[PDB]
Amino acid sequence: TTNCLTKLQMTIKNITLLRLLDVMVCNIKRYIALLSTIVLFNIESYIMEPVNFLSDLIESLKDTFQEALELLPKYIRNGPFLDDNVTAKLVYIFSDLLMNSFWDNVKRISSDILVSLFGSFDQQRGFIIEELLSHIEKLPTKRIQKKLRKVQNIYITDFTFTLMSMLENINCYSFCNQMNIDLLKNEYKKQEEFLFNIVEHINDTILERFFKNPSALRYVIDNFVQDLLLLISSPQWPVTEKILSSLLKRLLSVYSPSMQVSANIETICLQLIGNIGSTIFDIKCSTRDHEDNNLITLPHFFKSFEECIAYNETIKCRRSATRFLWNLRLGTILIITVDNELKKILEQIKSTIKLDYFSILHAFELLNLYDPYLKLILSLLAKDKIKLRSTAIKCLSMLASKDKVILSNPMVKETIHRRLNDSSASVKDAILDLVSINSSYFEFYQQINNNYNDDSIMVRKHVLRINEKMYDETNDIVTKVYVIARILMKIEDEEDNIIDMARLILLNRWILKVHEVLDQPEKLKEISSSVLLVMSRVAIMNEKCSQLFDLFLNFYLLNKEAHSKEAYDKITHVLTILTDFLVQKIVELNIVDKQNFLNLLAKFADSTVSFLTKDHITALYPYMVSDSDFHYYILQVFRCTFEKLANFKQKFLYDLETTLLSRLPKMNVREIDEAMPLIWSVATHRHDTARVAKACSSCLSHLHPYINKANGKLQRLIYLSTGFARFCFPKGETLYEHITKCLLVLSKDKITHVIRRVAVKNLTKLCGNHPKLFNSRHVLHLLDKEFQSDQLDIKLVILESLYDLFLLEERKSVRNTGVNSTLSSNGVCSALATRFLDNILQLCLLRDLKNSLVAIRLLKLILKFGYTNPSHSIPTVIALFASTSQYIRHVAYELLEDLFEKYETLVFSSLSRGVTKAIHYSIHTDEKYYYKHDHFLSLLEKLCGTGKKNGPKFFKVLKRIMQSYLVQKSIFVLCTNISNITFVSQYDLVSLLKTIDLTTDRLKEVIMDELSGIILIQLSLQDLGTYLLHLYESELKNKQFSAQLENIEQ
DNA sequence: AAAAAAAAAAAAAAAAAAAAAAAAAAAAAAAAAA
DNA sequence: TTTTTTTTTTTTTTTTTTTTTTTTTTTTTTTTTT
């Protein structure tokens, strides 16, 4: 009965054969569990029956239940009378139950029973070990806190929680309690050998079962190693250090030769070894001052051992853990002091602690194994596997996260600046993360910015983030200008997100940053000054940045359609105070900085809106009237301002006109074309302005005798007349028509060369300002005659005027239509470019640096605009590759790169003509130094050798060129350029060698049949073949200096 | 005013070359939801 | 304060077609004979 059983249990508890038999009989047939618990408390059939009853209960289930499972381990630990047969069933059922609130308690009870069974029996270690290992597939894939143990907010999976205690339960120190030190040494040796063998067995089986199915069975190890990392910092688990140690070497054996595995296995093992290395390096770094323990501080770390043991046994003893820790000291203890300490220990037997515990691990293998991990990481950095490289760089990054001074050694600097220049998207991202997490990364900022235009979106975004971080962090003006220039470059891209991010960060760091203070004193004098200095520095240094800055300031900041009205008044206000501060700085300062500030002011005035007021005009006036390049930017600012503002004072306008007309003879042509538009702009605000008419009439009367004479003062006179014509009086003939007639009169053959050039330049400028004048036949015939008269300087001024006209017209066209939203519900320049394209191309190949640069600039501008066909100019650019000058070659390379990226089909189509023209220019220019320069074919090859088929296509074009040419100097330069070509594949090289051998053999029979040129070209081809062979089924397998030698001929 | 054979020009079928699309797989980070 | 599902990036596997040739076939009109 239940009452009888309860009374019997109470009597047994108070006190502490027939009853056991009755309990067994009752269990055979809630009451059964109570009887089994009573029998267990009182205490092979009596045990075999309760075990079977518990097995049936567990099978059916899978507070009244838990007392039997709680009193079972006590009997197991106390009574060893259980035979080997009954132990197997309990071991197996409890191993099954351990894997798969009250359930956690049941699992803990099962773990306690398993460790008690391990401790009680010394001949069943392998049995329980294999039983626990056979259920390794039941580990949870995800580290959800629900099915996890504890022990600190540290969650431990149940399998290794049982396994670590089981392994540390060897506790040979207890044998020391049982006991001329001869027997204990042998016992300790046997115990340590047994533990070493079983830990190697566990590691081997874990790695084997992970290698069998690495993709699906990753968690089987992924948890374990990870948990081994979470438990290594606790002194309460010393055996864990061993578990990782023999494990780590196994991972180090993964990449050893004769152990080849799949790519996924390599990546997983590298991630695991990287985590292990990071953990052990973190442990090593956080130590005392002296932690050598390098097998060679000995007297005083026994005190550390004793303190650690005492603290462990004091707080949370867990007697198995401290028993194993006592054993761990045997290897260390086994000089005079060491012997005395060992004798004392034997006689006794017969935050700060966390740092102290790391000191004792240095003498062990785990901490000494860090160097092989680093060597393996460095070795794997250089392999061709992209995933391996990325994972290794990630491991280096997570290693350097703990210690920021790991970059001192040069073997990491070498890898980083080699990988920054050439890598893939993932590798570049990993190396950028590595350099960004480290505290100092200004040493490689140039390398980081060199990859700002990568194809991958992720690398570009991360580089932009690095640039923003550098701008926010550093204070050096040079690096700040560099990073802000890169950010401004990144405002145009094929990704809307990238350009939006760049615009947002630029707005935050140029406009909103100034708006934060909101007219707060003692803070605007620094941040606004720095921002204005940055903006001034942008407008220089590759003025494409200046163009992007103008675009950003005009078509983004001042467009009310782009952003909300409430977000536009702030922009306008910030720009107003910025302009006021810039004007004030210009006033007080009145050097390159001054020019930059003036350029910034001119750009601000040229904007779509006027942020300047009459007060700024009055402030600029005192040094405007007073008499450098100041008056040029000042005149530009005045011209831009007077086209938007009005309601000026009459007296001020009269004074401005007086001071402008007084200085007209003194000012040179450089700023006359801004002074005259200013004159007209100020004249139209002060109607009845006949004063400018009288001033123009004076110039006309002074110029009239000169034109009659045609049938130091004349230069300025004609310049002023042309300026008045093209900038004043736009409405019995019109003034500019009379000026064109006068210029045509002064542009005859009998006229002197200098005045003729000045007159033709002025006529070109006037026709540029008045397109209708280009329709007149006389000016067209004059321009054609100048272009076909072989004039060195007359053509140059026309080209410069056309360049200026093209720039102005394109700027006006871009400003006419910018960025806007259109709702349905709501050619002179091209003709001039096409007509004179041949003349420009012919002048591009001149031997004079100035004329060549002017012609190249005009050609580049025309090609960028797209007025004419690039096919007519593709060879010319290629001919510029033959130029010896480095700058001409570089600008030609940039132009050809742009032309390729636009029209690669036409570029490939015109390669033959380009090579022919380049060879002709090379032989024509340097009649004796023609073979000296041979750096045009290789640069063209690398430009068109970045594609999968661009290589074979370029080689096919090269073979066509070689066959076409089979002139002596042409063959010399072609051979010298071939000598410097890097060949992609050996099939191409052997084909070229066969062609050259056939050609030289044929020339050999030619010379034998037959003078100097033929033998010289034969010798040249033979020397090319010899140099090529001395530098570096067969055809199918093959598919996978020279100038001095040529000169030595004669 | 009658018949056969050969100069061919289009119109499909193969033998690859080559340039991207679909579709896991893996980290890495950020917005819900207990 | 943790786990959950989106959202974003390369990576690798095949799997697509879009080419560029080389073949054979088919039919067309012009040469040959009465």
Residue numbers in the entry: 221 to 236, 250 to 262, 278 to 291, 304 to 322, 336 to 373, 386 to 436, 439 to 466, 473 to 589, ...
Task: Give sentences copied directly from the paper behind this entry.
To elucidate how DNA actually associates with EQEQ cohesin trimers in the presence of ATP and Scc2, but lacking Scc3, namely under conditions in which DNAs are clearly entrapped within E-S and E-K but not S-K compartments, we used cryo-EM to solve the structure of EQEQ cohesin trimers (Smc1, Smc3 and Scc1) bound to ATP, linear DNA (40 bp), and Scc2C2 (residues 151–1493) to a resolution of 3.4 Å. First and foremost, E-S/E-K entrapment does indeed arise from the clamping of DNA between Scc2 and engaged heads in the manner revealed by both high and medium resolution cryo-EM structures. Scc2 holds DNA by way of a curved basic and polar surface located around the transition between its neck and head regions. The surface, which causes the DNA to bend slightly (~9°), is created by the spatial arrangement into a semicircle of a series of residues (e.g. S508, N557, K714, S753, S783, and K1324/25) from the ends of six α-helices and one loop (containing K427) that together engulf the phosphate backbone. This region includes all four positions mutated in Scc2-4E (S717E K721E K788E H789E), thus neatly explaining why the charge-reversing mutations lowered the binding affinity for DNA and inhibited entrapment of DNAs in vitro. Highly prominent is the binding of Scc2 to Smc1 through the docking of HEAT repeats 18–24 (residues 1127–1493) onto the F-loop (residues 1095–1118) on Smc1 head’s C-lobe and the coiled coils that emerge above. More conserved is a major contact mediated by salt bridges between a collection of highly conserved aspartate and glutamate residues located within two loops of Scc2 (819-EDEED-823 and 781-DD-782) and two key lysine residues (K112 K113) in Smc3. While Scc2 holds the upper half of the DNA’s backbone through a spiral of basic and polar residues, the engaged heads of Smc1 and Smc3 produce a 2-fold pseudo-symmetrical ABC ATPase heterodimer that binds DNA through two sites that are exactly two turns of the DNA apart and coincide with the major groove in the DNA.
Protein complexes containing SMC and kleisin subunits organise the spatial arrangement, or topology, of DNAs in most if not all living organisms. All contain a pair of rod-shaped SMC proteins with a dimerisation domain, known as the hinge, at one end and an ABC-like ATPase domain at the other, separated by a ~ 50 nm long anti-parallel intra-molecular coiled coil. Their association creates V-shaped dimers whose apical ATPase head domains are interconnected by a kleisin subunit (Scc1) whose N-terminal domain forms a three-helix bundle with the coiled coil emerging from Smc3's ATPase head, called its neck, and whose C-terminal winged helical domain binds to the base (or cap) of Smc1's ATPase head to complete the ring. Scc2 is essential for cohesin’s ATPase activity, for its loading onto chromosomes, for maintaining cohesin’s chromosomal association during G1, and for cohesin’s ability to extrude loops in vitro.
